[PDB]
Symmetry: D2
């Protein structure tokens, strides 16, 4: 698993299930190229986004649709989405876990990077 995203709900104390996200990779003209996509499972996790061979050096953006998640719970949130922008694989392959902890007016994100 070169890239996995885990999403937690800080209000309900649960995984954040069915959270949609897209992953983009910055192109040479500084535009965002589509790269991967999916939605979180019942464990709050999204696996299988990419393969080691396809996941090369670049600047990547994970755009998580947190607004739709809160709206489904009848809560008006602050953010349009949560974005996580990072350089990956600049020293060769690594495995990346992106974790996001969600509240209506706040989010916290961290990365675990393993060789």
């Amino acid at each position: 698993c070169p890239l996995m995203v885990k999403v937690l709900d800080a209000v309900r104390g649960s995984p954040a299930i069915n959270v949609a996200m897209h992953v983009f990779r910055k192109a040479a003209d500084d535009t965002w190229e589509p790269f991967a996509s999916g939605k979180t499972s019942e464990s709050g996790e999204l696996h299988g986004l990419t393969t080691e061979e396809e996941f090369v050096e670049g600047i990547y953006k994970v755009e998580i649709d947190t607004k739709s998640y809160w709206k489904a719970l009848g809560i008006s949130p602050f953010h349009e989405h949560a974005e996580v922008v990072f350089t990956a694989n600049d020293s060769g392959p690594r495995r990346y876990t992106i974790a996001a902890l969600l509240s209506p007016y706040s989010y916290s994100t961290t990365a675990v990077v393993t060789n």
Copy 2:
């Protein structure tokens, strides 16, 4: 003001107002002695807990009554309180700001220490 506490509400996007907290200092017999207490203002801040003369070296604990805060909003939260335990003034007097960001199943705390 050598010690100030600021509390924010991540559900409502507001200062956390009227939040009670108690400060303790570890005594020579290793018990927690009462040191100061108060409630946050309309800005989510609690000033005036102590003075430079009274705020000697020691181990201090701030216990923020997050449970009563959430219960008054009709929410059953996870934590009994949010606690911050730290050594203060080890190397001479410092000014401490403790900030806490609250959600029903999560809290995040940080300190700003200035000379």
Copy 3:
């Protein structure tokens, strides 16, 4: 002051000083137009980005240059920047405070919205 940003450093226990950030507003053609920019003060705060007249309804993005901040401290951080994307003034003028807490592999952001 309808928009203020405060940045804290979780490694050093200090305001994050001299942190650059750029604010964008989504244009009618869905592109990000420059709106305002500045750097945090010695208190970690950036005031004066905009005015009530200029800060109309819209989707805004604050991009905080966390990478340059960590690199100047000799740290190679994970994120390219910390981003906050939000709809503002949907239901009339509001005052927004965005707070960001920074670590090399993590950031946490919250908003306080007042009428």
Copy 4:
């Protein structure tokens, strides 16, 4: 796994390995009774703290020795320890995951509670 604790390092982007913690349960005289103990594995996780039969209604405190963790990295941290105090099993058994994200001057904690 009725009770699991997961600890992450926000500075290095890694699990926090070999982090010691003790779990206490509040007794009738309001003192803290020893309940469980251990240290995190190479994945940053501590499993096997208790069994369903032993883990009954009570107020529990997880005291995580974050200070020793930072000192091993030559970093002087703010907190003496990170504490997580919560009522558990008041509506019968649940499974609890306590997550803590550590920085030298900050920690963030959340709970995942599953029936």
